[PDB]
Paper text:
At the cell division site, [name] protofilaments form a highly dynamic, membrane-bound structure, the Z-ring, which serves as a scaffold for the recruitment of the extra-cytoplasmic cell wall biosynthetic machinery. Here we investigate the physiological function of [name] [name], the only cell division-associated protein from Actinobacteria known to interact with the conserved C-terminal tail of [name]. Our structural data revealed the [name]-binding pocket, defining the [name] homodimer as the functional unit, and suggesting a reversible β-sheet-mediated oligomerization interface possibly regulated via an alpha helical switch. We found that [name] filaments and lipid membranes have opposing effects on [name] polymerization, pointing to a complex dynamic role of the protein at the division site, involving [name] bundling, Z-ring tethering and membrane reshaping activities that are needed for proper Z-ring assembly and function.
To elucidate the structural basis of [name] recognition, we crystallized the [name] C-terminal core domain ([name]ΔML) in complex with a 10-residues peptide comprising the conserved C-terminal domain (CTD) of [name] (FtsZCTD) and determined the crystal structure at 1.6 Å resolution. The [name] structure revealed a symmetric homodimer, with monomers that contain a central four-stranded β-sheet stacked against two α-helices (α1, α2) involved in dimerization and capped by a C-terminal α-helix (α3) on the opposite side of the sheet. The homodimer contains two identical FtsZCTD-binding pockets, each made up of residues coming from both protomers, defining a dimeric functional unit for the [name]–[name] interaction. This 2:2 binding stoichiometry can explain mechanistically why B. subtilis [name] has a bundling effect on [name] protofilaments. The bound FtsZCTD is clearly visible in the electron density map, and adopts a hook-like extended conformation that fits into a mostly hydrophobic binding pocket formed by conserved [name] residues, where it is further stabilized by additional intermolecular hydrogen-bonding interactions. The [name]-bound structure of the FtsZCTD peptide revealed yet another non-helical conformation, reflecting the large conformational space that this small, highly conserved sequence can adopt in different biological contexts. It is interesting to note that SlmA and [name], despite their different structures and binding pockets, interact with the same highly conserved hydrophobic motif of the FtsZCTD. The interface was further validated by mutating two FtsZCTD-contact residues in [name]: F131A and K125E. Compared with the wild-type protein, the single mutant [name]ΔML,F131A was greatly compromised for [name] binding (apparent Kd = 340 + /− 47 μM), whereas the double mutant [name]ΔML,K125E/F131A exhibited no detectable binding in the range of protein-peptide concentrations tested.
Author numbering:
A (entry chain P): 434 to 442
B (entry chain B): 65 to 151
C (entry chain A): 65 to 149
D (entry chain Q): 434 to 441
The structure:
């Protein structure tokens, strides 16, 4: 799955 | 601060330069990855994460093939990004 | 003399925050990817390339598992990074 | 192969 990384969420 | 929204259709992988140039200039960028391979799309998201981190921007996933990078001082809504991307 | 070179051992993509913080502060960073898969290492190099583009920095490959990000106007040479690594 | 991208 393609997602925004944890540190930018 | 009020930012322009630059839509980017990534026709090839060398188009990360277009996202970088517009975002570094203080523009919000909404980019479509539907023309890229799965591997190339992963590379673009990682590169955009780097741009975003360096300039303290905001990153968001609009859909499976659409992401956006927004400057720190800009208050750009999800609906405004969706309209610019024609979603 | 005593220029700041920040060493970073990567365990996952999330450790990219450490490279980003130091480089954004104007420090050179030398990062080791020997604990990562080749796919994870590719992700780190792409993130670091994003950092470099944003701040007009320089990126260099020291070896198969070691890369460095250097600020635009850093007074550090390749040999200084090699010695630190 | 792991390399610095073309544009850098």
């Amino acid at each position: 799955d393609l997602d925004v990384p944890s540190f930018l969420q | 601060y009020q930012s322009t929204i630059v839509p980017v259709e990534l026709h090839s992988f060398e188009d990360a330069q277009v996202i970088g140039g517009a975002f570094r200039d203080g523009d919000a960028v909404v980019f479509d990855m539907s023309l890229l391979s799965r591997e190339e799309a992963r590379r673009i998201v990682d590169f955009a994460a780097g741009l975003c981190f360096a300039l303290r921007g905001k990153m968001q996933k609009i859909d499976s093939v659409t992401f956006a990078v927004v400057p720190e001082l800009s208050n750009i809504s999800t609906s405004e990004l969706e309209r610019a991307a024609r979603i």
